[PDB]
Amino acid sequence: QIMEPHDTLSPAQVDEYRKNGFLVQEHVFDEEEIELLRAEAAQEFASGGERVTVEIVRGVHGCHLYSEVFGRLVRSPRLLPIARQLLRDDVYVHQFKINAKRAFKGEVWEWHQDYTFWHHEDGMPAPRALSAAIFLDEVTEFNGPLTFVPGGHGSGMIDADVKWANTLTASLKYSLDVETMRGLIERNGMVAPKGPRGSVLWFDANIPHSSVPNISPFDRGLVLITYNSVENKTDVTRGTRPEWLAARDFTPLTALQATSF
Ligand SMILES: [Cl-]
């Protein structure tokens, strides 16, 4: 039994990722694969307990530690080789979350950089990390797409006002002020990457992003896997969050092979 040989990004794709801070690959996973992930996401929403965020289940953290399916997903030959390529290291999962934005539902998600949280909360020493967002549904203009400042990762951590942090909370602990964002957006603009179901959106730990409610009759499910460089492992002595928000096992991930079961 055979896995398709590892596909990595072209130089042009790598260059685009480093310049813009994000990159979409369309149609990575097929409809049947996505349906398996959707069904498992529903199970995690139902069984997640303290790991679930509710408005009314909004999201769940840490599923790769509790779900065999999601544990295998993070080792997928469609994902792991590219994470290794972009971070130029062995990698592990720092954080796993599923963000469901149901038809005609959702709230405004304030501008933020993930790295600000991971640095201050978890002791991540540098922004040598990224997220892979798997599109469980087509992402459009109207179902609350992740919206970015292209190139906005390239001036490092932007000063935020501090208020366990959680980027799925209503009020973010570290949000970006109007003056800071104005300047960044005036220089760089805004982009909401679109794509079909089964696409993967790769984005930098330090890219500013935000989103709006879903005004479509269609759901917008995202599965977000945050890969971190093993060299860039967090300082567990500075971190206090549970394992399902910030991983403590820095064992390098290996790729899934094709077996008889
Ligand atoms: Cl976080």
Side-chain angles (χ1 to χ4, degrees), residues 95 117-118 166-167 241:
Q95 192 177 85
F117 287 70
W118 299 336
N166 185 330
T167 65
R241 299 204 296 174

Side-chain angles (χ1 to χ4, degrees), residues 11-26:
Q13 282 175 306
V14 171
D15 291 351
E16 174 177 343
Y17 175 79
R18 303 226 186 264
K19 180 172 72 69
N20 289 337
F22 65 86
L23 178 79
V24 173
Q25 295 180 286
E26 295 198 356

Side-chain angles (χ1 to χ4, degrees), residues 6-54 57-176 178-259:
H6 294 176
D7 260 68
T8 49
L9 298 178
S10 69
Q13 282 175 306
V14 171
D15 291 351
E16 174 177 343
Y17 175 79
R18 303 226 186 264
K19 180 172 72 69
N20 289 337
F22 65 86
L23 178 79
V24 173
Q25 295 180 286
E26 295 198 356
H27 291 134
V28 174
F29 299 99
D30 68 38
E31 288 278 341
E32 289 65 50
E33 288 173 322
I34 287 297
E35 173 55 25
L36 289 181
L37 296 187
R38 188 205 62 67
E40 191 69 358
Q43 283 185 232
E44 280 289 300
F45 286 147
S47 67
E50 61 177 348
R51 300 184 295 113
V52 177
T53 301
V54 298
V57 284
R58 184 192 167 137
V60 60
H61 285 88
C63 315
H64 66 301
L65 299 170
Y66 295 92
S67 157
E68 288 224 4
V69 169
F70 288 132
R72 287 170 59 98
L73 175 64
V74 303
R75 298 171 59 207
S76 174
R78 307 289 192 199
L79 296 175
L80 181 61
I82 291 169
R84 288 173 172 183
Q85 176 184 23
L86 286 178
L87 301 186
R88 303 180 70 180
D89 197 4
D90 274 323
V91 299
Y92 73 97
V93 177
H94 170 62
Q95 192 177 85
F96 188 107
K97 56 186 173 297
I98 308 175
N99 297 13
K101 191 181 294 190
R102 301 288 189 236
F104 303 120
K105 290 193 171 62
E107 233 55 277
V108 168
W109 205 26
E110 306 173 72
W111 286 101
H112 66 287
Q113 296 168 290
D114 286 322
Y115 176 60
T116 302
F117 287 70
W118 299 336
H119 181 78
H120 286 300
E121 295 288 293
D122 306 322
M124 182 177 292
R128 192 181 176 182
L130 59 71
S131 296
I134 304 167
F135 291 5
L136 297 182
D137 304 282
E138 178 187 358
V139 171
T140 75
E141 182 172 355
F142 310 109
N143 64 353
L146 297 182
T147 303
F148 298 94
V149 177
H153 62 309
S155 302
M157 241 188 331
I158 306 167
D159 197 61
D161 292 302
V162 183
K163 308 174 185 180
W164 300 338
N166 185 330
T167 65
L168 301 193
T169 295
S171 191
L172 296 190
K173 185 173 182 175
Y174 314 82
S175 54
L176 294 179
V178 172
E179 189 169 304
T180 51
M181 285 306 317
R182 187 186 309 123
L184 217 56
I185 293 169
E186 279 171 352
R187 289 192 295 286
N188 292 297
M190 286 171 289
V191 173
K194 313 306 191 300
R197 168 176 288 157
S199 302
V200 177
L201 165 64
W202 300 93
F203 66 92
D204 192 86
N206 218 13
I207 193 169
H209 62 288
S210 179
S211 67
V212 300
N214 175 358
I215 62 164
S216 85
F218 310 115
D219 293 348
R220 189 230 63 179
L222 298 178
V223 176
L224 297 102
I225 308 163
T226 301
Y227 293 99
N228 189 24
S229 150
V230 166
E231 176 168 287
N232 192 52
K233 62 185 178 184
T234 54
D235 187 1
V236 292
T237 74
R238 287 189 209 119
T240 272
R241 299 204 296 174
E243 195 179 357
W244 50 262
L245 284 185
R248 303 169 192 172
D249 177 355
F250 307 128
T251 302
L253 290 174
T254 70
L256 204 60
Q257 298 293 337
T259 66

